Design a protein around this ligand. Sequence first.
Ligand SMILES: C[C@@H](CC(=O)N1CCC(O)(Cn2cnc3cc(Cl)ccc3c2=O)CC1)c1ccccc1
Ligand SMILES: [Zn+2]
Ligand SMILES: [Zn+2]
Length: 330
Amino acid sequence: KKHTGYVGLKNQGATCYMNSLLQTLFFTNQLRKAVYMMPTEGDDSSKSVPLALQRVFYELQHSDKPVGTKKLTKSFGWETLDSFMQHDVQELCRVLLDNVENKMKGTCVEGTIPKLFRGKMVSYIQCKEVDYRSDRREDYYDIQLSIKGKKNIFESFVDYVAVEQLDGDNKYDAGEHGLQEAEKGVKFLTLPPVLHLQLMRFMNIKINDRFEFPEQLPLDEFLQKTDPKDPANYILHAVLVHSGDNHGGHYVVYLNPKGDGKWCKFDDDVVSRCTKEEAIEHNYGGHCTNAYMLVYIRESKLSEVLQAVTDHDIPQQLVERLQEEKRIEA
Ligand SMILES: C[C@@H](CC(=O)N1CCC(O)(Cn2cnc3cc(Cl)ccc3c2=O)CC1)c1ccccc1
Ligand SMILES: [Zn+2]
Ligand SMILES: [Zn+2]
């Protein structure tokens, strides 16, 4: 708030990963400005996620005390005790982004979400007997990686695109060719500017094995067609962590908001400086605390995502409605 210039959020309940995700989205400047320009004039008071998300971001940018999220949770109706224990973190990122993306249709910033988090991949099926291949284009906003028996992110990506053999009792129904031996896999067509990677650490029991991830991650090796104009080099932006015996822990997140390597810890309402080692290597696991989700930004688009945002980037109409609500509380 004063020691770092950043204000955290107060844990109003058992929200688990929620507070960690909000700070990550808030420091996605390119995404932040898009939400400020959302037409939320005649939206419901406390029944609109886009509006309720706008308020949080504004209070985060201006307020000097810990920010609250009570109104936000009720926005999407997760007020039950076990609400968060029955949902993955990416499920909330998808729930949040889908609501704002729909509310942004037809404006100047429509489609901003796919521009930042949307990527293209291809799932296929190839058989060695005949010559029938079936490809399927798909879109992805978050990537679920496996970490059991995986040393680092490199091996995890290798297993993600690894080919699977459909033979023996798992032969592929080649349609007119009957059961056939084939192999199935997936390939990465493109990588979005902002990369969200969830680590499969909750396979009903938390696993605390050691998993390594670098500050700079080159992903050109996993693309179908490389582009010398823009390499697939990504920079670590945020690290969400958790420590606990299978059912409860302190949810902390590490961030370098400007992408300059100056990291900070966000224990809800307590924001403080920290070393890059405490944010990266100290969260590999092996202690007993380990990260469960990573955020990477394309090196070429780092300045675009983290562009500077001032108080002039918020419409005057929204500022009054937000100030009028805060003032009305007085
Ligand atoms: C208490 C929870 C925190 C929490 O409630 N959650 C749900 C779990 C997470 O989404 C990570 N995760 C874990 N396992 C997966 C398995 C498959 Cl198959 C696909 C996706 C995932 C995945 O995303 C994080 C958010 C936790 C358990 C274990 C380790 C760390 C945290
Ligand atoms: Zn996400
Ligand atoms: Zn704390």
